[PDB]
Amino acid sequence: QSACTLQSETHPPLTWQKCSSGGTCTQQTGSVVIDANWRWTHATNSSTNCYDGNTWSSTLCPDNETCAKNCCLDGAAYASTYGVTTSGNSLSIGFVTQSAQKNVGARLYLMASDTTYQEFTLLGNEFSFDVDVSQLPCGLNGALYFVSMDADGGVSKYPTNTAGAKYGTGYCDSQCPRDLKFINGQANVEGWEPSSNNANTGIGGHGSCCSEMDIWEANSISEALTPHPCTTVGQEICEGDGCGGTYSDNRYGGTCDPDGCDWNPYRLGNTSFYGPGSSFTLDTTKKLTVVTQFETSGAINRYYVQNGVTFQQPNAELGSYSGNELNDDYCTAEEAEFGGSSFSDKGGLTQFKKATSGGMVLVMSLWDDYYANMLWLDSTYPTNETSSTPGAVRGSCSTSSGVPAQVESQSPNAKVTFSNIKFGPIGSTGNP
Numbered sequence: 001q002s003a004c005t006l007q008s009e010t011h012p013p014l015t016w017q018k019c020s021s022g023g024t025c026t027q028q029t030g031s032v033v034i035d036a037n038w039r040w041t042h043a044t045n046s047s048t049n050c051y052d053g054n055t056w057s058s059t060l061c062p063d064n065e066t067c068a069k070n071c072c073l074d075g076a077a078y079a080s081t082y083g084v085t086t087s088g089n090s091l092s093i094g095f096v097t098q099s100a101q102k103n104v105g106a107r108l109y110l111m112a113s114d115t116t117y118q119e120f121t122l123l124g125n126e127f128s129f130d131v132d133v134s135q136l137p138c139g140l141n142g143a144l145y146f147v148s149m150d151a152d153g154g155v156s157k158y159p160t161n162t163a164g165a166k167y168g169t170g171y172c173d174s175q176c177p178r179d180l181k182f183i184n185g186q187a188n189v190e191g192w193e194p195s196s197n198n199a200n201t202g203i204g205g206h207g208s209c210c211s212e213m214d215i216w217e218a219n220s221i222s223e224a225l226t227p228h229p230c231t232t233v234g235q236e237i238c239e240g241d242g243c244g245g246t247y248s249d250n251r252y253g254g255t256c257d258p259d260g261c262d263w264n265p266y267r268l269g270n271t272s273f274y275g276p277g278s279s280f281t282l283d284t285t286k287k288l289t290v291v292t293q294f295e296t297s298g299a300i301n302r303y304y305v306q307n308g309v310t311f312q313q314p315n316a317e318l319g320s321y322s323g324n325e326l327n328d329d330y331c332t333a334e335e336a337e338f339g340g341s342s343f344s345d346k347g348g349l350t351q352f353k354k355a356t357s358g359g360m361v362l363v364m365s366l367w368d369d370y371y372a373n374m375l376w377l378d379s380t381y382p383t384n385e386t387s388s389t390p391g392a393v394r395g396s397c398s399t400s401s402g403v404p405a406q407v408e409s410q411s412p413n414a415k416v417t418f419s420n421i422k423f424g425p426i427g428s429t430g431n432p
């Protein structure tokens with residue numbers, strides 16, 4: 001697609017800290033951009049819609065190439081359309097925003113300039129941020145994560161994309177998403193199947209896969225840390241059911257691991273660690289600092305700060321594993337105790353090190369789950385299992401509270417606030 005300017009595009013500014021091993025942090029001035037799928041797509045020379053509701057124009061978009069020639073992405077009114085604001089080092093994302101159309105959530109990338117995403121090399125480094133999850137009920141996910149996307153949004157590899165990172169193109173993740181309207185500088189209208197339960201979305205014939213590090217998938221009830229390796233580390237198109245992921249009939253049928261090696265303290269038995277109110281170690285009614293270190297072995301270390309008090313990730317015992325670090329022994333014990341083999345089939349933490357030794361883009365999002373209702377995060381899952389099945393209980397949420405029609409109606413003014421992003425060598429993000 002190309003870009004149009006019926007609505008000017010002004011990326012909300014967002015500051016963050018780059019820290020040094022020399023004992024100081026320096027403020028960086030970035031900005032955020034909304035993902036292209038959220039945008040109005042229209043004809044290059046008129047206001048006629050290329051996509052509206054959950055279907056495409058037959059005359060502008062008869063096929064993937066013709067559509068990309070005929071259509072453009074427009075600018076975004078961040079606050080009034082999407083419920084997105086920034087305030088210094090803080091980013092707020094709202095849940096439901098009703099304007100002329102219903103908007104649900106947002107996915108945003110951190111930029112380095114007007115036309116390039118910021119790329120971070122995680123391996124040997126640490127990432128710290130603060131989060132307020134207090135206004136996230138069961139069924140929602142305020143997510144902060146990294147993907148192996150191209151810095152330029154794909155423009156150099158697919159030059160029929162002239163909108164680029166300035167308009168939030170180029171997304172990929174370990175779910176190999178097929179709901180994207182543009183992949184690799186072409187539309188995704190071929191094979192488009194409107195969602196039966198979502199008047200605004202559908203599934204196309206192609207998807208967009210890459211490595212993903214879920215630093216933070218969370219609400220006020222549960223939180224999880226999850227690396228997802230892929231057999232091709234960076235962005236790769238996939239075709240139809242061959243995609244796997246959330247949008248295909250067989251989730252385990254493609255090149256990426258859609259489940260990952262997750263660490264959820266509740267799931268591991270620590271049911272008083274994280275939750276609302278004073279009976280939990282981390283009280284999700286109040287703001288929390290989350291620190292994540294990418295150790296050079298490939299392991300991942302986590303601690304938290306709340307009201308000046310530091311808490312390390314809690315210890316887990318699972319099988320022969322005992323410890324508090326997400327490491328090879330953990331991931332092996334997890335597959336043995338809880339079942340599954342997609343993580344190790346895709347090469348585990350050794351394949352994942354290929355992603356973290358390269359550049360990844362920071363993504364911040366808020367979403368509800370039209371496929372699995374976020375039960376994997378905060379409830380009993382899979383839903384054919386029972387509470388006695390090892391690993392099935394991930395939070396205290398009911399089965400039905402995460403249905404989008406319920407959460408969107410009951411909690412439209414849910415929101416997440418991310419702030420105070422700090423990045424640098426291990427041990428540096430506490431620097432002044």
Ligand SMILES: *[C@@H]1O[C@H](CO)[C@@H](O)[C@H](O)[C@H]1NC(C)=O
Pocket residue numbers: 269270271272273281311312313314315
């Ligand atoms: C949960 O973690 C906290 C922080 O480490 C600890 O004090 C508490 O004992 C843990 N509970 C369980 C069941 O492991």
Ligand SMILES: [Sm+3]
Pocket residue numbers: 295301325
């Ligand atoms: Sm360690």
